[PDB]
Scaffold this active site. Structure first.
Site, PDB file in Angstrom:
ATOM      1  N   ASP A   1      -7.631  -6.236   0.849  1.00 11.41           N
ATOM      2  CA  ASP A   1      -8.684  -5.250   1.069  1.00 11.41           C
ATOM      3  C   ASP A   1      -9.948  -5.606   0.262  1.00 11.41           C
ATOM      4  O   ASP A   1      -9.924  -6.491  -0.591  1.00 11.41           O
ATOM      5  CB  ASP A   1      -8.200  -3.817   0.750  1.00 11.41           C
TER       6      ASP A   1
ATOM      7  N   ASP B   1     -13.314   8.194   6.432  1.00 11.97           N
ATOM      8  CA  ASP B   1     -12.792   7.817   5.122  1.00 11.97           C
ATOM      9  C   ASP B   1     -13.090   6.366   4.765  1.00 11.97           C
ATOM     10  O   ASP B   1     -12.252   5.666   4.193  1.00 11.97           O
ATOM     11  CB  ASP B   1     -11.284   8.100   5.063  1.00 11.97           C
TER      12      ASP B   1
ATOM     13  N   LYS C   1       3.621   0.688   9.108  1.00 11.62           N
ATOM     14  CA  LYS C   1       3.278   1.987   8.541  1.00 11.62           C
ATOM     15  C   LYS C   1       4.511   2.833   8.848  1.00 11.62           C
ATOM     16  O   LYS C   1       4.756   3.176  10.003  1.00 11.62           O
ATOM     17  CB  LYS C   1       2.043   2.562   9.247  1.00 11.62           C
TER      18      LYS C   1
ATOM     19  N   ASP D   1      -6.994   2.160   8.577  1.00 17.14           N
ATOM     20  CA  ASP D   1      -6.565   3.502   8.210  1.00 17.14           C
ATOM     21  C   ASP D   1      -7.353   4.621   8.870  1.00 17.14           C
ATOM     22  O   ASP D   1      -8.248   5.212   8.266  1.00 17.14           O
ATOM     23  CB  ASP D   1      -6.621   3.694   6.703  1.00 17.14           C
TER      24      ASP D   1
ATOM     25  N   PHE E   1      -1.814  -7.650  10.601  1.00 12.99           N
ATOM     26  CA  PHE E   1      -1.893  -7.748   9.136  1.00 12.99           C
ATOM     27  C   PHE E   1      -3.055  -8.588   8.613  1.00 12.99           C
ATOM     28  O   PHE E   1      -3.445  -9.538   9.256  1.00 12.99           O
ATOM     29  CB  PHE E   1      -0.580  -8.326   8.605  1.00 12.99           C
TER      30      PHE E   1
ATOM     31  N   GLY F   1       0.778  -1.223   0.000  1.00 16.11           N
ATOM     32  CA  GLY F   1       0.000   0.000   0.000  1.00 16.11           C
ATOM     33  C   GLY F   1       0.814   1.280   0.000  1.00 16.11           C
ATOM     34  O   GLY F   1       1.664   1.501   0.868  1.00 16.11           O
TER      35      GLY F   1
HETATM   36  O1  LIG Z   1      -2.844  -5.434   6.829  1.00 15.00           O
HETATM   37  C1  LIG Z   1      -2.876  -4.227   7.083  1.00 15.00           C
HETATM   38  N1  LIG Z   1      -2.836  -3.680   8.315  1.00 15.00           N
HETATM   39  C2  LIG Z   1      -2.992  -2.332   8.249  1.00 15.00           C
HETATM   40  C3  LIG Z   1      -3.099  -1.354   9.351  1.00 15.00           C
HETATM   41  C4  LIG Z   1      -3.260   0.074   9.052  1.00 15.00           C
HETATM   42  C5  LIG Z   1      -3.380   0.509   7.672  1.00 15.00           C
HETATM   43  N2  LIG Z   1      -3.540   1.783   7.144  1.00 15.00           N
HETATM   44  C6  LIG Z   1      -3.550   1.804   5.788  1.00 15.00           C
HETATM   45  S1  LIG Z   1      -3.490   0.283   5.054  1.00 15.00           S
HETATM   46  C7  LIG Z   1      -3.313  -0.496   6.534  1.00 15.00           C
HETATM   47  C8  LIG Z   1      -3.099  -1.914   6.868  1.00 15.00           C
HETATM   48  C9  LIG Z   1      -2.988  -3.119   6.070  1.00 15.00           C
HETATM   49  C10 LIG Z   1      -3.022  -3.292   4.735  1.00 15.00           C
HETATM   50  N3  LIG Z   1      -3.452  -4.601   4.173  1.00 15.00           N
HETATM   51  C11 LIG Z   1      -3.681  -4.905   2.887  1.00 15.00           C
HETATM   52  C12 LIG Z   1      -3.208  -6.236   2.436  1.00 15.00           C
HETATM   53  C13 LIG Z   1      -3.365  -6.627   1.024  1.00 15.00           C
HETATM   54  C14 LIG Z   1      -4.026  -5.700   0.085  1.00 15.00           C
HETATM   55  S2  LIG Z   1      -4.335  -6.154  -1.586  1.00 15.00           S
HETATM   56  O2  LIG Z   1      -3.669  -7.386  -1.883  1.00 15.00           O
HETATM   57  O3  LIG Z   1      -5.752  -6.052  -1.756  1.00 15.00           O
HETATM   58  N4  LIG Z   1      -3.622  -5.016  -2.561  1.00 15.00           N
HETATM   59  C15 LIG Z   1      -2.257  -4.757  -2.688  1.00 15.00           C
HETATM   60  C16 LIG Z   1      -1.193  -5.773  -2.394  1.00 15.00           C
HETATM   61  C17 LIG Z   1       0.196  -5.411  -2.698  1.00 15.00           C
HETATM   62  C18 LIG Z   1       0.553  -4.098  -3.281  1.00 15.00           C
HETATM   63  C19 LIG Z   1      -0.535  -3.118  -3.489  1.00 15.00           C
HETATM   64  N5  LIG Z   1      -1.894  -3.449  -3.163  1.00 15.00           N
HETATM   65  C20 LIG Z   1      -4.465  -4.353   0.518  1.00 15.00           C
HETATM   66  C21 LIG Z   1      -4.346  -3.972   1.920  1.00 15.00           C
END
Ligand SMILES: O=C1N=c2ccc3ncsc3c2=C1CNc1ccc(S(=O)(=O)Nc2ccccn2)cc1
Lengths: 260, 298
Positions: free
Chosen positions: B86, B127, B33, B145, B82, B11
């Site tokens: 999403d 958001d 983060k 987030d 984790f 992300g």
């Molecule tokens: O797992 C997470 N814990 C978080 C805690 C706070 C926070 N604030 C913004 S994002 C976030 C957090 C995450 C993010 N998890 C996440 C895991 C996989 C995907 S995805 O596979 O749907 N998309 C992807 C995967 C790799 C590169 C770009 N996008 C998207 C979000």
């Protein structure tokens, strides 16, 4: 928000949080180099900073919390008390304001007695000592919750209760020993009485569990503070509340007795 | 910070970049983060100060947990629990086949619970959008987030320069209202809810005005009767076209009555009468809710 649903939950919660995010009642005594008076001078100065930058009153109540909290466990020499204060304000701003003033601005309002580098480092130190717990319940918040219980709203009673609660921020001398929900209760009734001869409403006694009697001590103190207000060493808050934005409530002559 | 091993970037961020990391001592997989800090010359960011502070108070099964905060010299890292992916990615995979209604219900349910927890703890998310909602392979979905999050011990003044996403922005905010309210968050879930059902974004506006017009075109143009005060709001205009409300069975056909019911109450115009998370959880639409597992592609 603006919906009766969580209002009760939120109140119950701020009540729990004020106990946790509260400072050390007698920290000033154990503080070798600073005194209530130095603090009163500091808070007053912050009051002006708030006006100068058109910050919210919440931003002022918070910074005061950050400061008292910090001093409750960190020995500070008078020469740094302002640096602490500035950072606390900076933080409160970043937390509460839509867009806080730039660091440069906080370094400025201190007459460059401190470095931009110093401000930023004190900010980290405060964050570390406060362990990032900045969302502290304020007297200003509790008034807000109580204001819904008016019948109806009297924008003059509010400005007055705000004035009184903002006055408590100044004198740690008698106030550090009252929880914000209590000071707010005192400030509210006292304002409600002065402007409309009304008292602590039954709705509030039930919502807060506080009886008029139970607020008596703080009340006596606040009333007394309200009375001597004109002859206090610090006047920034009174000058702030004579403005027509707050309906010059700082000019309303306080009752002479409360008949409690 | 030495006990962590970065695995991949999961992300991008204007507030910070997020990496999937691993605790080399415990084996725990975590999301890091990382915050610029060294730059800005304005100390610690607000989104960081607010996300850390408010999240430390919110411990719920439907809100991603903040595990630790490692601040040092020029680097500040937020350590979070984790999750695999999403909802945005999931809705995409589901494009052809679509998400089963029992899972849509399950997800809405949990979201409303996490959100209801935020609100009763005086925290506005502000958001809510598919990419800010995380899911795992066991059927859980979590609010994530809390960068634009705000505590509302006192009413939160609305930004003059719009920050929140456009497609899920409530009409109040578009009409120029003074404060935010828990209502803005329910509107977002309301939009997310339909999207899951129709496989399409409910109000995909190009601009603030296009956004406002798509909402009207679907829910009809609001008036003083439907929403007392509308006409008086800052950015409202008399020259606004007068559209008629459309039958919800044409907006979200795959939904039953309870479904169209809840959704309409979540997309209720006047933000004082729009259903609350707390109240929605008691809607008959959920009387048979369960916890289905989704089928996620790596
Ligand atoms: O797992 C997470 N814990 C978080 C805690 C706070 C926070 N604030 C913004 S994002 C976030 C957090 C995450 C993010 N998890 C996440 C895991 C996989 C995907 S995805 O596979 O749907 N998309 C992807 C995967 C790799 C590169 C770009 N996008 C998207 C979000």
């Amino acid at each position: 928000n603006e919906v009766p649903d969580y209002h009760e939950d939120i109140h119950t919660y701020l009540r729990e949080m004020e106990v946790k995010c509260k400072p050390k009642v007698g920290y000033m005594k154990k503080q070798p180099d600073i005194t209530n008076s130095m603090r009163a001078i500091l808070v007053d100065w912050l009051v002006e900073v708030g006006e100068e930058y058109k910050l919210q009153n919440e931003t002022l109540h918070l910074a005061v919390n950050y400061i008292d909290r910090f001093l409750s466990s960190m020995s500070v020499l008078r020469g740094k008390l302002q640096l602490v204060g500035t950072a606390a304000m900076l933080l409160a701003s970043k937390f509460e304001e839509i867009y806080p003033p730039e660091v440069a601005e906080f370094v400025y309002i201190t007459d460059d007695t401190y470095t931009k580098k110093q401000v930023l480092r004190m900010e980290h130190l405060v964050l570390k000592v406060l362990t990032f717990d900045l969302a502290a319940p304020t007297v200003n918040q509790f008034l807000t919750q109580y204001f819904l219980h008016q019948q109806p709203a009297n924008c003059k009673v509010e400005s007055l209760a705000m004035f009184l609660g903002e006055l408590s921020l100044i004198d740690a001398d008698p106030y550090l020993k009252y929880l914000p929900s209590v000071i707010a209760g005192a400030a509210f009734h006292l304002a409600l009485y002065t402007v409309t001869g009304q008292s602590w409403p039954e709705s509030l006694i039930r919502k807060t569990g506080y009886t008029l009697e139970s607020l008596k001590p703080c009340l006596m103190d606040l009333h007394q503070t309200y009375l001597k207000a004109p002859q206090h060493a610090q006047q920034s808050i009174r000058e702030k509340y004579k403005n027509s934005k707050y309906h010059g409530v700082s000019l309303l002559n306080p009752p002479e007795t409360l008949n409690l | 910070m030495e006990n962590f091993q970065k695995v991949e970037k999961i992300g991008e961020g204007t507030y910070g970049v997020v990496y999937k990391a691993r605790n080399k001592l415990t084996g725990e997989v975590v999301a890091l983060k990382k915050i610029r800090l060294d730059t800005e010359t304005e100390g610690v960011p607000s989104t960081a100060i607010r996300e850390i502070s408010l999240l430390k108070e919110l411990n719920h099964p439907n809100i991603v947990k903040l595990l630790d905060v490692i601040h040092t010299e020029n680097k500040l890292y937020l350590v979070f629990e984790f999750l695999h992916q999403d909802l945005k990615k999931f809705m995409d995979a589901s494009a052809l086949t679509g998400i089963p209604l029992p899972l849509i219900k399950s997800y809405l349910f949990q979201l409303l619970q996490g959100l209801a927890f935020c609100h009763s703890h005086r925290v506005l998310h502000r958001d809510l959008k598919p990419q800010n909602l995380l899911i795992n392979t066991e059927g859980a979905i979590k609010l994530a987030d809390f960068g634009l999050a705000r505590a509302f011990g006192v009413p939160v003044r609305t930004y003059t320069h719009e920050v929140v996403t456009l497609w899920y922005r409530a009409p109040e905010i578009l009409l120029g209202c003074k404060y935010y309210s828990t209502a803005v968050d329910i509107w977002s879930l309301g939009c997310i809810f339909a999207e899951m059902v129709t496989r399409r974004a409910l109000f995909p506006g190009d601009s603030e005005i296009d956004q406002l017009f798509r909402i009207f075109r679907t829910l009809g143009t609001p008036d003083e009767v439907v929403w007392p005060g509308v006409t008086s709001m800052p950015d409202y205009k008399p020259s606004f076209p007068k559209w008629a409300r459309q039958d919800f069975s044409k907006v979200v056909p795959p939904l039953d009555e309870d479904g169209r019911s809840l959704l309409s109450q979540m997309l209720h115009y006047d933000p004082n009468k729009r259903i609350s998370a707390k109240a929605a959880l008691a809607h008959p639409f959920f009387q048979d809710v369960t916890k289905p597992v989704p089928h996620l592609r790596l």
